[PDB]
Amino acid sequence: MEMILEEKDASDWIYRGEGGANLVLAYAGSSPLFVGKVIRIQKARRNDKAIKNSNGVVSVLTSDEQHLWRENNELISSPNKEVLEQRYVQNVIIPLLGPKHVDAGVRVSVSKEFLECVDKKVTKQRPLWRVNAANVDTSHDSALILNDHSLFSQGITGDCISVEIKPKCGFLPTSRFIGKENMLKTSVSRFKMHQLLKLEYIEISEESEYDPLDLFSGSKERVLEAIKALYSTPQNNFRVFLNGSLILGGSGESTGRTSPEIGYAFEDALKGFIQSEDGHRTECFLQLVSDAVYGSGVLDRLLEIQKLDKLDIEGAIHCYYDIINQPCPICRPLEAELSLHALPLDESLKIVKEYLIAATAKDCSIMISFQSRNAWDSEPGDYVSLKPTNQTFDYKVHFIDLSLKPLKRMESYYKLDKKIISFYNRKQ
Ligand SMILES: Nc1ncnc2c1ncn2[C@@H]1O[C@H](COP(=O)(O)OP(=O)(O)O)[C@@H](O)[C@H]1O
Ligand SMILES: [Zn+2]
């Protein structure tokens, strides 16, 4: 006794965005049951080896994954990927990050024709650069309904300004399971090293000013610096929305540095939202975002989950091969490595499981939506007061893109890590 989204309904949705796995459409119809919501639809994914089993079938979970995630029977009982991701978020991630900042969503039934319609729609509405990317999987019979976190409330009460950050990893591993030649990993961030490789593959116009160790520092000055740095070189780490509409960033990691032209337009798109004179809104806005980030302490709870990566991939990869019952292709072995192989099967499972949960935390994004208060409105939830403009802003913070990482990807994490540290070493 609910509903199926049909071909008729497809006209009510408009393209908002996409990542590697999902398309996101925002609601544009009149029904109050959907105003201020988005729909998340899974892409058809080939050629992804990590999601196939021994026979090349894209099963919900492989036998190895079922064994690894055994402690939640509800998670392994999922009939499809939509149910799997929702139960992962609800049962594994929400206990860790809290229900306040995480929205598991509501599953909705969709017909093939609805999805075939959305397929054609995204083809027309996508930026030209994304036209050959993977479209909607039309064999799935479900999609996900979520609150649009680019909106504070379903409607407008000034405007809503929404800031989306992909913060990446905010800590450095210990030397405990890192080889002597790779020791720079304990002093230079993964993000900073990755920037060098990305620059070499000319995937970016220049090195990002952003340093995730600033964002997660616990220092209010350093948090501000991180925000300022993200404004200057957004790449794919920083976006700003005006009532759900892009006003900064959004062109992938290839997004250009904020030029005077983009800077000028941004300052004006802030008119009315920040009650400050022309040219001054941008500084006050960055201060606003910095204050909300720091004041919420939402990043402290995210850092702890990232810190579930105890051994680093260099250490963790050994536990992985013990799980899948294969001789280790990595082990001139170290004494630290051999002790890990001596660990009980149960603690070896725990380590890898915690590594994968950590990856979710390292690869997710935060959305901070803002609403300008009136002086005739009563006392506020969570808020930030900008003293120089005498303005109070209500804010909400939500974690998005909290996906379950497949077990076989451990191999990819190692390959990539090996490549990043190798390159960064010989560049010194
Ligand atoms: N609940 C939401 N509210 C508003 N915008 C969203 C929401 N979820 C996703 N988006 C937008 O869609 C984009 C891609 O969504 P995401 O779920 O991260 O895709 P993927 O899972 O493929 O990475 C995001 O960068 C964000 O701008
Ligand atoms: Zn080994």
Fraction in beta strands: 15-25%
> What Rg, in angstroms, do the CA atoms define?
22 Å
Helix content: 25-40%
Oligomer: monomer
Work out the count of structural domains: 2
Separation of the first and last Cα atoms: 64 Å
Alpha plus pi helix count? 14
Q: Give the ligands present.
A: adenosine-5'-diphosphate, zinc ion
Q: Main sheet: which strands, in order across?
A: 1-5-6-4-3-2
Biggest sheet, in brief? 6 strands, mixed
The tally of beta strands, per DSSP, is: 12
Order of helices and strands: EEEEHHHEHEEHHHEEHHHHHHEEEH
Query: Structural class of the helix and strand makeup?
Result: alpha+beta
Organism: Arabidopsis thaliana
Family: Belongs to the IPK1 type 2 family.
GO biological process, one term: myo-inositol hexakisphosphate biosynthetic process
Protein name: Inositol-pentakisphosphate 2-kinase
Structure commentary:
The protein is of the alpha+beta class. It has two domains: 1-155, Phosphorylase Kinase, domain 1 (2-Layer Sandwich); 156-428, no CATH class. It is built from 14 helices and twelve strands. The protein has helices at 63-68, 73-76, 81-97, 112-125, 190-200, 212-215, 220-232, 260-269, 281-296, 298-306, 313-323, 335-342, 345-363, 410-426; strands at 4-5, 13-18, 22-27, 37-42, 106-110, 142-147, 160-165, 238-242, 245-248, 365-372, 383-386, 391-400. The strands form two sheets. The protein has a six-stranded mixed sheet. The termini are far apart. The site of adenosine-5'-diphosphate has 19 residues, from strand 2, strand 3, strand 4 and strand 6. Pfam families: Ins_P5_2-kin. ATP binds at residues 19-22, 40, 147-149, 164-166, 239, 401. It is an enzyme of class 2 (transferase).
